[PDB]
Symmetry: C2
Subunit: 279 residues, 2 copies
Amino acid sequence: ARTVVLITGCSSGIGLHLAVRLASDPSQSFKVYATLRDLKTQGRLWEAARALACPPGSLETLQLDVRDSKSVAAARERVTEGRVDVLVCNAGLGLLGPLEALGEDAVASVLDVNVVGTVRMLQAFLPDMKRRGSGRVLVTGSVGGLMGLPFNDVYCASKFALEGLCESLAVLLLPFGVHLSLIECGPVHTLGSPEEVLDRTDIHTFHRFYQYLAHSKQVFREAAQNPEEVAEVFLTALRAPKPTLRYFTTERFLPLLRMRLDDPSGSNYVTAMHREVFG
Amino acid sequence: ARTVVLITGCSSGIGLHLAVRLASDPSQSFKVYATLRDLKTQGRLWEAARALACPPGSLETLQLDVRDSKSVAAARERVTEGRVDVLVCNAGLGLLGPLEALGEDAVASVLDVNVVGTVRMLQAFLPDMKRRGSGRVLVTGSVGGLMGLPFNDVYCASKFALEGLCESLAVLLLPFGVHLSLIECGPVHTSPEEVLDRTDIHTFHRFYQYLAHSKQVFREAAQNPEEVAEVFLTALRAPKPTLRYFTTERFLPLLRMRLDDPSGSNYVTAMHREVFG
């Protein structure tokens, strides 16, 4: 019988493309529960599943809101096979702006979804994998969790939080046979404001922001991968017999992660990334 | 022009010790606002300050609960000089255990106090430093924010979060004249029915292995809050301060081993045997 996969954040992007890539795999070894915050966004998913000709019963949708442990629980109970072989923690919010303009609730929500939500997922599904002696957990990580970037203060916070969360658990899970990996993504082919911003921020920050934005759209256009490409990395990690804690989707940033970790006082990275972003 | 300093989490430990040290400084160069979750708890602080004859008016206490933006803003406007030269984000909570055994609320508390709490402070105090073109922010970091350790999953997630938040602001903040630094601490001096039900027997084992191993590292490695406090003073008076300062070099090897292997497999192997016999 098949490898049972459950994936959070499947309405679009990586989650959507991974779920159908797995459910449509010519091996037909995967049963996929693609989970979604709101079942009303499932159109694109079911369209793509139908384009790739996913066999009947390879793909099912569940509603799963990672802010709500009872929603988490109810989705787990809906896994008829009664176990999960592969958990993919992929749901995540973005947030982009000068720290002082971001609404307090929005800061809270990014943490609650990206970090607390990933904790809830692991709390709900890890016990069974431990008791069993097997399971793959994959977490959609980020380059913004390895290095900080201006105006991504809270997004970066949350992705660094995943590093810490996962690295700690991975040290516990060795003699269990459960393999937690992070899939470190760079930019990908799939948040700001105006008078809201400037009122709260200051006249010089206001302009340093769009010098970041209009710079970012450059790096978008030279390394923003396909989610198919990314999905495919999640696959290599599943089929890995001894998977590592991190996998990288693109190499275009391993220069800086060399430079960053040369200086343990860290002010080399600060200087170099400031020049590289602005001038 | 005295240096105005505002510090969170001053009822005890690092925050208390830094507060009295700056207020007693022979120069009387510093005016200290030492803040507390609850003011009723300020007894020990003033006793410590009285011990070093901190002159009158060199130390003020305030209530500041970092979970509440109004507490943060009210505390800010009690700063009679109308500015802060040095902001110390030191308030923090701990949480230790197997992930599946920790309460959901406890998990959200740690993130809210440790991460969002620090974001609130920065939201309330940074803009003033930006328009003025000057200011220092010191944040109490941890080696647990540089490397993950078993049963410290949520604690580490929060200290890692601090690293990303601060490193991201630091890149924005060079040209404004505002220096942010993390003071990276190691350990610092100051039930199995309920465990077992919420966790397999396998993990119940490891947790107590870890607990015995932690005891030892604490006996060997722990620092006085006063030694830590002195590193904050170095950062304060560094003419161009760096993003991190370490209160110990003890764990820098383990940290480099982790920096050697970006795939992270080496770190985990090493720390697993190192921790579990």
